TrEMBL record, chain A:
Name recorded for this polypeptide: NADH dehydrogenase [ubiquinone] iron-sulfur protein 8, mitochondrial
Similarity remark: Belongs to the complex I 23 kDa subunit family.
Record: residues binding [4Fe-4S] cluster 2: 28, 57
Span of domain 4Fe-4S ferredoxin-type: 9-38
Species for this entry: Sus scrofa
Residues of the full protein shown: 96 to 154 of 212
Subcellular location: Mitochondrion inner membrane
Positions with a binding annotation for [4Fe-4S] cluster 1: 18, 21, 24
Entry function: Core subunit of the mitochondrial membrane respiratory chain NADH dehydrogenase (Complex I) which catalyzes electron transfer from NADH through the respiratory chain, using ubiquinone as an electron acceptor. Essential for the catalytic activity and assembly of complex I.
TrEMBL record, chain C:
Gene3D superfamilies: 3.10.20.600, NADH-ubiquinone oxidoreductase 51kDa subunit, NADH-ubiquinone oxidoreductase 51kDa subunit, iron-sulphur binding domain
Subunit structure: Core subunit of respiratory chain NADH dehydrogenase (Complex I) which is composed of 45 different subunits. This is a component of the flavoprotein-sulfur (FP) fragment of the enzyme. Interacts with RAB5IF.
Gene: NDUFV1
Molecular-function annotations in GO: 4 iron, 4 sulfur cluster binding; FMN binding; metal ion binding; NAD binding; NADH dehydrogenase (ubiquinone) activity
Name this polypeptide is given: NADH dehydrogenase [ubiquinone] flavoprotein 1, mitochondrial
GO CC annotation terms, alphabetical: mitochondrial inner membrane; respiratory chain complex I
Residues holding [4Fe-4S] cluster 4: 360
List of residues binding FMN 2: 63-64, 73, 91, 184, 219
Residues that coordinate or bind FMN 7: 64, 91, 94-95, 219
Organism (species): Sus scrofa
Annotated membrane topology: Peripheral membrane protein
Binding-site positions, [4Fe-4S] cluster 5: 360, 400
Keyword Mitochondrion carried by entry: yes
UniProtKB/TrEMBL annotation, chain D:
Transmembrane parts of this sequence: none
Its job: Accessory subunit of the mitochondrial membrane respiratory chain NADH dehydrogenase (Complex I), that is believed not to be involved in catalysis. Complex I functions in the transfer of electrons from NADH to the respiratory chain. The immediate electron acceptor for the enzyme is believed to be ubiquinone. May be the terminally assembled subunit of Complex I.
Location within or outside the cell: Mitochondrion inner membrane
Boundaries of the shown chain within the full protein: 68 to 110 of 110
Domain of life: Eukaryota
Family classification: Belongs to the complex I NDUFV3 subunit family.
Name of the protein this chain belongs to: NADH dehydrogenase [ubiquinone] flavoprotein 3, mitochondrial
Subunit details: Complex I is composed of 45 different subunits. This is a component of the flavoprotein-sulfur (FP) fragment of the enzyme.
Organism in which the protein naturally occurs: Sus scrofa (Pig)
TrEMBL record, chain E:
Cofactor names: [2Fe-2S] cluster
Enzyme class: translocase
Family as reported in the entry's similarity comment: Belongs to the complex I 24 kDa subunit family.
EC number(s) recorded for this UniProt protein: 7.1.1.2
GO CC entries: mitochondrial inner membrane; respiratory chain complex I
Species the sequence originates in: Sus scrofa (Pig)
A single GO molecular function term of this UniProt record: 2 iron, 2 sulfur cluster binding
PANTHER family cross-referenced by the UniProt entry: NADH DEHYDROGENASE [UBIQUINONE] FLAVOPROTEIN 2, MITOCHONDRIAL, NADH DEHYDROGENASE UBIQUINONE FLAVOPROTEIN 2, MITOCHONDRIAL
Entry protein name: NADH dehydrogenase [ubiquinone] flavoprotein 2, mitochondrial
Record key words, sorted: 2Fe-2S, Iron, Iron-sulfur, Metal-binding, NAD, Translocase, Ubiquinone
Length: 59, 230, 433, 43, 217
């Protein structure tokens, strides 16, 4: 259960898991996440910006 | 006067004849749940979310299409109305896709909000869901028909407000699909309003896709300058 | 002696449909020998009020299945003219599984129906009658057209009906394979060239019907008799059956009986007497009976223990929690998979739902899947109560009564044959570990 | 008077246009239809 | 089971707007007679009979036929599409010369309808959604046809064949594909809805006109 440095994961095929729903951004108590998104070249719903300010994050 | 007396939860209200149960209820600040009723569109009655209990009547009535009678006492929060709402939302969500994170209607969905306010919190649907192929109606509007709840608001808007009779339903029963039945562009100077009237993500804006969520946006009230209508 | 207590044996002199078996000429000349079109001119000259009163005192109720009192229903349309023409629509959709009565009337006694349309239209002040017939009944529709041609040729209908100076037209309209088009509002929408989707009530057809004009929708059987009731008296009709269950009824006995048939009988006949006398008894003897659906698929079924003393009328079948319906008796013996039969009925209802309203459109398909899994025993006993509550949600929340008719057989099966479901579930459980 | 026979045998020789031919034949007996006042609701 | 068919149209050389379809002059007279029945100012009520007439002339309903019907009655083509897709008697795909419907609802299911269906299948060698390679038979299942008392029955091109057995249906099939046409009706020496044997009611001759007429009329 230990909470440590953040990381963005992938599916076994190598595709990113994140779909830019922004639920993590809306729930972050410290407002440490900033997200921008758009349709990818294949039409997939993927982020273009995903920042986490680790000096704002409360882990 | 011509006004008649009706009671909403034991409270007297005076309304003009022909007024529906929904309007009589909203004259005291009570908003009946709805999916297919729009006040600028002709009444449909198909969704069945507006069913309320009239006192001393064994049957629940569609508040969006039933005019109030003299002396009726509406019961907007009785056990019968709540059970009707829960059943209707259960049926609505039975075949709905688990698309909320990838849906642009995420924080702006009447399905979501009315499920949180009037529906249940669990599911007892243990079957497979249905899937509907997408229909292309042009560049401006993105179509994801699986999400459609068959309210038919878009059809009424096209037929009446826009004067374009291109949208309809094909088939019947569970496999009933809203579309044009042919590859056709739904082109109109007012074609973008079917995005707003659609309560779900079945009709969404294509230029706006995936860029933002409703809770992030800051709302500024302004005036349009693209024509002289203002 | 008055106030009869036993019913179920009427002789041929009191049978309205005297050519039910097509054994006499159905052509105008043969129908006139049977008394058709006799004193029509006088009946029309009596007036709409006289005919409405004759129907009222006759105690007749709607033969389509709902059993609504025909007198008040037809008097709802006795309003003064407001600029809109008034129409009669005769429901010949004939969609209920197990039911075959209207087909025989149309194909064997069409002049009865034509005269009934004329008399009923005069009673309601209707300008013309539209007959909506099932699209599969192509030969029946053409026979009806031949009868209407004969009536037009003889001056019985059209301009200046028989002698009354009352103009009345009889049109025939064919549907295209939709059981939902038997709903009166769905039928009206189908006549207007739209999808066969029911309307909401109110308004009622007596206010806004076909083409947005007052309309009365009546069953073919209900309409055909109308002429006979007016002639033989109406009070004669009330002498049959119990109170508020008056008159004569046409029964369709199908399923596991020795001789399936369509027969005419008194209203309050007991079910066992009817099956034993006309159908020739259950296959393998009366002891082999398992369950019976008394009034078509839309009504809940009853076990053999209830069929022993039940009367075949509206109120007695209501007391047995099944209702009379269309009086189409489907018989199931002890050699049938009853769960499979109810699942087939539910699949029928799934394939016939119009899809307009949410409860029917999703819940009927949901019950269809649940019953498909029940047939194999692929469920667990809590799903029985889950299905009961699903059926309950569907019932009373739909626009038309097709959701009611899909929920009721499910409730009947759960009520009377829950142990069979549990046995199947446990068999599937232990068979598959 | 007999019952051994079957009298509804005319439908054994009906074609695919019987119903519409009968409708065409009956077209000359009907009363004039009432009018709404418009050619169509879209007028 | 499921519908199987699709409720969307995709263009094809056999089915496109430019596919030639038009009504014969006799069919135009029939359309005029059909239109006349309905009230002036209401013509959309004639879409059902006109569309059925087009299907009868052509054998099925291409997109061009739907467009022609919409043009003749001056209605939006979408409404004609709705009617064509809603009703199951309309063929939006070509069918065989003899289109067979087998009823499989519970009253016919009780009287061994599955035997009839499998007899047809092994006689023709096709499944319940296919057409024979010579395009002469198309076999499907349908709901109650209203011939439940005479069940098990199948309907062929506007004809009812009731009280069937596998031998009877095979005889009907091989008589139909020889160029003849079998006589409709029951195949059990019954030729009506009467009880199988005995005619328990209506044994007396029908009464004369005015026999029970009440007084004062
Ligand atoms: N013969 C067949 O093939 C089939 C028959 N049915 C039967 O249809 C029955 C249900 O049909 P519904 O029409 O929905 O029943 P219903 O109770 O709603 O009304 C039946 C008749 O009574 C009239 N009516 C009822 N209330 C009225 C009012 N307040 N004012 C004026 N008129 C009124 C209606 O206009 C209608 O004509 C079922 O019991 C079913 O057994 C169902 C399917 C097929
Ligand atoms: C799903 C559904 C199907 C129906 N099908 C028929 C039908 O085939 N024939 C019929 O006469 N009535 C049918 N009804 C009921 C009709 O409303 C009824 O015929 C009509 O009210 C005439 O009633 P009456 O016989 O009392 O005049 C159906 C109702 C429902 C809900
Ligand atoms: S936006 Fe956040 S919550 Fe949504 S998928 Fe990406 S990481 Fe997960
Ligand atoms: S329309 Fe609403 S309920 Fe449906 S997937 Fe999108 S956000 Fe979720
Ligand atoms: S697309 Fe939207 S507006 Fe149109 S019927 Fe479906 S849910 Fe209603
Ligand atoms: S209950 Fe079923 S058939 Fe009736 S209107 Fe609703 S969806 Fe259509
Ligand atoms: S809002 Fe009333 S039924 Fe849809
Ligand atoms: S069940 Fe087969 S004809 Fe009705
Ligand atoms: Mg939307």
């Amino acid at each position: 259960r230990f909470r440590g440095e953040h990381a963005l994961r992938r599916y076994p095929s190598g595709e990113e898991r994140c779909i830019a729903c922004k639920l993590c951004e809306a729930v972050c108590p410290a407002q440490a996440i900033t997200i921008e998104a758009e349709p990818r070249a294949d039409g997939s719903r993927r982020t273009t910006r995903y920042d986490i300010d680790m000096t704002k994050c409360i882990y | 006067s011509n006004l008649i007396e009706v009671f909403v939860d034991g409270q007297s209200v005076m309304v003009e004849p022909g007024t529906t149960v929904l309007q009589a209820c909203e004259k005291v600040g009570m908003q009946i749940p709805r999916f297919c009723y729009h006040e600028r569109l002709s009444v449909a009655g198909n969704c069945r979310m507006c069913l309320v209990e009239i006192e001393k009547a064994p049957k629940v009535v569609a508040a969006c299409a039933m005019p109030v009678m003299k002396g009726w006492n509406i019961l907007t929060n009785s056990e019968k109305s709540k059970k009707a709402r829960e059943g209707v939302m259960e049926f609505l969500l039975a075949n709905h896709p688990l698309d909320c994170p990838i849906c642009d209607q995420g924080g702006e969905c009447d399905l979501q909000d009315q499920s949180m306010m009037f529906g249940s919190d669990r599911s007892r649907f243990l079957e497979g869901k249905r899937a509907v192929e997408d229909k292309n109606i042009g560049p401006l509007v993105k179509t994801i028909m699986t999400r459609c709840i068959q309210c038919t608001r878009c059809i009424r808007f096209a037929s009446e407000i826009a004067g374009v009779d291109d949208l309809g339903t094909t088939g019947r029963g569970n496999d009933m699909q809203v579309g044009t039945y042919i590859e056709k562009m739904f082109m109109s100077e007012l074609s973008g309003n079917i995005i707003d009237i659609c309560p779900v993500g079945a009709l969404t804006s294509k230029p706006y896709a995936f860029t933002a969520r409703p809770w992030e946006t800051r709302k500024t009230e302004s005036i349009d300058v693209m024509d002289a209508v203002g | 002696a008055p106030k009869k207590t036993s019913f179920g044996s009427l002789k041929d002199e009191d049978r309205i449909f005297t050519n039910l078996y097509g054994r006499h000429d159905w052509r105008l000349k043969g129908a006139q020998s049977r008394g058709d079109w006799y004193k029509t001119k006088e009946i029309l000259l009596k007036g709409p009020d006289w005919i409405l009163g004759e129907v009222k005192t006759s105690g007749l109720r709607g033969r389509g299945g709902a059993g609504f009192p025909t007198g008040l229903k037809w008097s709802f349309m006795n309003k003064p003219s407001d600029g809109r023409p008034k129409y009669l629509v005769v429901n010949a959709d004939e969609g209920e599984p197990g039911t075959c009565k209207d087909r025989e009337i149309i194909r064997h006694d069409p002049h009865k129906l034509v005269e009934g349309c004329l008399v009923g239209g005069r009673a309601m002040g209707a300008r013309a009658a539209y007959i909506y017939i099932r699209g599969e009944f192509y030969n029946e529709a053409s026979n009806l057209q031949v009868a209407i041609r004969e009536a037009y040729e003889a001056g019985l209908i059209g301009k200046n009906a028989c002698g009354s100076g009352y103009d009345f037209d009889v049109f025939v309209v064919r549907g295209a394979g939709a059981y939902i088009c038997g709903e009166e509002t769905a039928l009206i929408e189908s006549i207007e060239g739209k999808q066969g989707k029911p309307r909401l009530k109110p308004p009622f057809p007596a206010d806004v019907g076909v083409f947005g004009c007052p309309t009365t929708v009546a069953n073919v059987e209900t309409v055909a008799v109308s002429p006979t009731i007016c002639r033989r008296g109406g009070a004669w009709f009330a002498s049959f059956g119990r109170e508020r269950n008056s008159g004569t009824k046409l029964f369709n006995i199908s399923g596991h009986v020795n001789h399936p048939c369509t027969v005419e009988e008194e209203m309050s006949v007991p079910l066992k007497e009817l099956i034993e006398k006309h159908a020739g008894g259950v296959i393998g003897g009366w002891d082999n009976l398992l369950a019976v659906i008394p009034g078509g698929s839309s009504t809940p079924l009853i076990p053999k223990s209830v069929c022993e003393t039940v009367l075949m009328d509206f109120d007695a079948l209501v007391q047995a929690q099944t209702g009379l319906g269309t009086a189409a008796v489907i018989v199931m013996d002890r050699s049938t998979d009853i769960v499979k039969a109810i699942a087939r009925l539910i699949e029928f209802y799934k394939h016939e739902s119009c899809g307009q309203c949410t409860p029917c459109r999703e819940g009927v398909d949901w019950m269809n899947k649940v019953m498909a899994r029940f047939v194999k025993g692929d469920a667990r006993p809590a799903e029985i109560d889950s299905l009961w509550e699903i059926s309950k949600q569907i019932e009373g929340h739909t626009i038309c009564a097709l959701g009611d008719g899909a929920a009721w057989p499910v409730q009947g099966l759960i009520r009377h044959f829950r142990p069979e479901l549990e046995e199947r579930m446990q068999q599937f459980a232990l068979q598959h570990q | 008077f007999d019952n051994s026979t079957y009298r509804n045998l005319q439908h054994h020789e009906y074609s695919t246009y019987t119903f519409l031919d009968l409708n065409v034949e009956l077209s000359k007996f009907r009363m004039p239809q009432p009018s709404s006042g418009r050619q169509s609701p879209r007028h | 089971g499921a519908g199987g068919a699709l409720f969307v149209h995709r263009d094809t050389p056999e089915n496109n707007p430019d596919t030639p379809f038009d009504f014969t002059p006799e069919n135009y007279k029939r359309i005029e007679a059909i239109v006349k029945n309905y009230p002036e100012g209401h013509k959309a009520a004639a879409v059902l009979p006109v569309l059925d007439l087009a299907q009868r002339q052509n054998g099925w309903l291409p997109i061009s036929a739907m467009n022609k019907v919409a043009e003749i009655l001056q209605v939006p083509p979408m409404r004609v599409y709705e009617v064509a897709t809603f009703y199951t008697m309309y063929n939006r795909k070509p069918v065989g010369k003899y289109h067979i419907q087998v009823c499989t609802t519970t009253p016919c299911m009780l009287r061994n309808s599955d035997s009839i269906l499998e007899a047809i299948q092994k006689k023709l060698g096709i499944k319940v959604g296919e057409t024979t390679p010579d395009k002469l038979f198309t076999l499907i299942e349908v709901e109650c046809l209203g011939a439940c008392v005479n069940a098990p029955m199948v309907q062929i091109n506007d004809n009812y064949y009731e009280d069937l057995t596998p031998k009877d249906i095979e005889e009907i099939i091989d008589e139909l594909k020889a160029g003849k046409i079998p006589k409709p009706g029951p195949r059990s020496g019954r030729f009506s809805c009467e009880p199988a044997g005995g005619l328990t009611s209506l044994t007396e001759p029908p009464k004369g006109p005015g026999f029970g007429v009440q007084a004062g009329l």
